[PDB]
Amino acid sequence: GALDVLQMKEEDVLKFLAAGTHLGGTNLDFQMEQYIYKRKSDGIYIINLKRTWEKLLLAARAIVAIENPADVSVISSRNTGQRAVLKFAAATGATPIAGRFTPGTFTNQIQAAFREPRLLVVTDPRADHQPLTEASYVNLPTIALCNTDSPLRYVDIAIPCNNKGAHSVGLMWWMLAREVLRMRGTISREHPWEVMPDLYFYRDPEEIEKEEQAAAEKAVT
């Protein structure tokens, strides 16, 4: 922010760099030349993390500007970012549409999922372009946490972080979810937020139920 209340806060940058989020590599869109710093020696592009910090506080200002909490239609298509959305909307009280977005949902007013929001927020622009196209008709702003590839037609407060890494996507939902409730009265702004950001990371196959309970034969059995 403009204040020190909303600053960079160096310790949480140790979660950016423990989730990647300075990763591009392949190439860049010509309208995300602004959120770049350089190409590496590897061909990889890294992102000025104060730019994705300055938009993310600007994007969280957009959600708080919505009066009705159950109104920001939060959508995703790719698998990393489906666990994240579903308890984002459980956390801040939003409306999740996960998995395959049914075409003709925002605005075909007959069937059951006729949902008319006043704001929208996306995981990936080109992997989820079907709600981007449809939100252009109910004159409704969208926020797409976009990578250097993904295009920028129908997006407005596009966050330049990352969209492909597993730990990359979940933190950016966490860092946004921590903030949108901090501009509300929930997080006490000096004490941290108790929801550990490992909660928002995409699920493995079913080798889960072996290893977690093989470290629980001294506290259960």
Binding site: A18, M196, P197, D198, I208
Partner: peptide
Amino acid sequence: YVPEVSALD
């Protein structure tokens, strides 16, 4: 499934 070790740390 909240883990005891953070892979952010």
